[PDB]
């Protein structure tokens, strides 16, 4: 047996896959410097932002007039979005619905409405049907989450509810995130309908008429869609992570506002100007960052690394080796 | 220079960097993106 981490001769044997090494110079591996500490930097915003009244609301809007709300400059918490109901559907595209407590987003959009029971599958990327092309359309590069839950005990009534409407007739399919509130009559025929009902003149709205008696696949469902935008920005909104003091001139691993890395942070001389947040290099990688608690610029440089070679005669003659470190001045090994 | 510039390709994945892929998706799903990136980079280096 041979231990591949005892001495350079053993490493050479382990690389060559042999118990005898002949005369020559062999390239064994590379040497790096490991991190010692760990820091996390997040913005100092501590207030919360509206999530209770988005879900604990009295009346949601119809499908064709879906309610839109913008969420920014807060601290998001998603633990409270667990006990909505005994059973509910929670599907996230582009993110996993367990890791969105340590991610920083630019702007959050919340769209709320109420849908027929069996049409929940139609709120999805690139799906066709009745509401996905005439009421609510989603893009093909969506990055967000969809939540749906039962609303029989609250919405359906015995006396009769007719306050929820959808649209059935339209010229062309809707652009994503586009709303229509027109009531102009349909023109299937060749003659004008002069704003009166008749054949080929249909009013492009319809009612649900929910009653507590229909089958399990027909009761109303409440649907809310969350849209994110994970890009480069001041990062107005993100969740509950505790900050830590920053260190300099030492190889550590860092998490700057959602950007994870390892390296050495140094005071910067770049000529940033107000709107510039971070910088790049020739190879399209991050080089400079701006600390979101002091508004100062730091430069990132990976800590020392290099290549190691072993010079030995044949194992038949001796077991002595010499080590060559490539491209380094060994006053700074 | 072109070998260096190939590092910004996506190869059908959701991002051109690895840390955000590992910090946004669960282990069951990040494997496809990691495989795509690894295969693309291996092909580029082999061609070189």
């Amino acid at each position: 047996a041979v231990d591949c981490a005892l001495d350079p001769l053993s490493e050479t044997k382990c690389t060559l896959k042999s118990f005898t090494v002949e005369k020559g110079i062999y390239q064994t591996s590379n040497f790096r410097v490991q991190p010692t500490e760990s820091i996390v930097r997040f913005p100092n915003i501590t207030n919360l932002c509206p999530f209770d009244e988005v879900f604990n609301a009295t009346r949601f809007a119809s499908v064709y007039a879906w309610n839109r709300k913008r969420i920014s400059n807060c601290v998001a918490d998603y633990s409270v979005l667990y006990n909505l109901a005994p059973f509910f559907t929670f599907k996230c595209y582009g993110v996993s619905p367990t890791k969105l407590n340590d991610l920083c987003f630019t702007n959050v959009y919340a769209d709320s409405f109420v849908i027929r029971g069996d049409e929940v599958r139609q709120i999805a990327p690139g799906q066709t049907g009745n509401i996905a092309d005439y009421n609510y359309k989603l893009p093909d590069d969506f990055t967000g989450c969809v939540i749906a839950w039962n609303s029989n005990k609250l919405d359906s009534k015995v006396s009769g509810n007719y306050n929820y409407l959808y649209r059935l007739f339209r010229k062309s399919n809707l652009k994503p995130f586009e709303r229509d509130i027109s009531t102009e009559i349909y023109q299937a025929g060749n003659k004008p309908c002069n704003g009166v009902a008749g054949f080929n003149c249909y009013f492009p709205l319809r009612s649900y008429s929910f009653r507590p008696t229909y089958g399990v696949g027909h009761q109303p469902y409440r649907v809310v869609v969350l849209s994110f935008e994970l890009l480069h920005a001041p990062a107005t909104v993100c969740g509950p992570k505790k900050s830590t003091n920053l260190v300099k001139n030492k190889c550590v691993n860092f998490n700057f506002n959602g950007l994870k890395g390892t390296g050495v942070l140094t005071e910067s001389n770049k000529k940033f100007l107000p709107f510039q947040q971070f910088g790049r290099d020739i190879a399209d990688t991050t080089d400079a960052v701006r600390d979101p608690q002091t508004l100062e610029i730091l430069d990132i440089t990976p800590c020392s690394f290099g290549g190691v070679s072993v010079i030995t005669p044949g194992t038949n003659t001796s077991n002595q080796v010499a080590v060559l470190y490539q491209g380094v001045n060994c006053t700074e090994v | 220079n072109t070998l260096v510039k190939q590092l910004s390709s996506k190869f059908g994945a959701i991002s051109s960097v690895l840390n955000d892929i590992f910090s946004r998706l669960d282990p069951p799903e990040a494997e496809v993106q990691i495989d795509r990136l690894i295969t693309g980079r291996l092909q580029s280096l082999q061609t070189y």
Binding site: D281, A283, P302, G307, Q326 | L3, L7
Partner: peptide, 28 residues
């Protein structure tokens, strides 16, 4: 020599960026 000097003069940050990706150049 004179001609050798002329020939040597005739033929002539990116290096650091390449090195930080793992590509190095060995000496003769």
């Amino acid at each position: 020599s004179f001609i050798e000097d002329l020939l040597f003069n005739k033929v002539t940050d990116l290096i650091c960026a390449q090195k930080f990706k793992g590509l190095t150049v060995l000496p003769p």
